[PDB]
Amino acid sequence: ELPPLKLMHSFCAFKADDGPCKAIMKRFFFNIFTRQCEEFIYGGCEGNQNRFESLEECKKMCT
């Protein structure tokens, strides 16, 4: 079984970044103003580490 690896909680602090590409992909980020995990549309490329596939993953990581 796979041991837990150390996580970088500063990854929750970036602004949401849709990136430059034009796909329509639902992702989640921790919003440092509202202090809540929120949905945003990701274009499929680039961005930053404040990008989670599901709300619960964002909540587990960031709240």
Partner: antibody, heavy 121, light 107 residues
């Protein structure tokens, strides 16, 4: 014990498609993303894309329009396809497990054995 | 994308010595840097993640250091089995890799 075993033919004629199957064991595709990276003498290691546990994909913008990544969780299989290969796509292609579950921003801890791809007529 | 530069393509080393491999990012990447080891014919192996964390089972003679744009992998006591290629990697906007540093034996 984690393993990623690649299968699929590596000889590709000009502008044809490359298809590789990555069959994983020791972990679930329901819990981990799987990356695709290639390595060539000319361009070194180049990351291409990752398929996350719920099927969402992040792409390298330079390859996005000719990449198709799918998977079958039940069979522990990820399917990589790249269209219209050119001579400069000759490289070793790897699948690799995301180190940190379903999270962006870390590393790739277990790698497939690689597929040597030759683009030539 | 971010460019990771390893200025030393080749380093000549001696068993038992300390060896330091440098990597510079074209702009700040914070701590999101990993190091890999690779030998001919084989796939990369992960040594270090998040700049300074040893991966599972990696010998404790490997240390990663650095933040921002400058990163260093140090082997405190080079073993023969450490002769290999070493690559840095950042994962901010997307993963990119350094060009590699190959250790060789001085003779």
């Amino acid at each position: 014990q984690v393993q990623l075993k690649q299968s699929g033919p590596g000889l590709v004629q000009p502008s044809q498609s490359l298809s590789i199957t990555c069959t994983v064991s020791g972990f679930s595709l329901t819990n981990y993303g799987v990356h695709w990276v290639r390595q060539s003498p000319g361009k070194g290691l180049e990351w291409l894309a990752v398929i996350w546990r719920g099927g969402s994909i992040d792409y390298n913008a330079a390859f996005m329009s000719r990449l198709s990544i799918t998977k079958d969780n039940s069979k522990s299989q990820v399917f990589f396809k790249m269209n219209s290969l050119q001579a400069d796509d000759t490289a070793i292609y790897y699948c690799a497990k995301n180190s940190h579950g379903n999270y962006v921003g870390y590393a790739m801890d277990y790698w497939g054995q690689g597929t040597s791809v030759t683009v030539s007529s | 994308g971010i460019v990771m530069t390893q200025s030393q393509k080749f380093m000549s080393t001696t068993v038992g010595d300390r060896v330091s491999i440098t990597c510079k990012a074209s702009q700040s990447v914070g701590p999101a840097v990993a190091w890999y080891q690779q030998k001919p014919g084989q796939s990369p192996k992960l040594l270090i993640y998040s700049a300074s964390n040893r991966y599972t089972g990696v010998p404790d003679r490997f240390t990663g250091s650095g933040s921002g744009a400058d990163f260093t992998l140090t082997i405190s006591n080079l073993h023969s089995e450490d002769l290999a290629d070493y690559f840095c990697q950042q994962y901010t906007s997307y993963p990119t890799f350094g060009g590699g540093t190959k250790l060789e034996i001085k003779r």
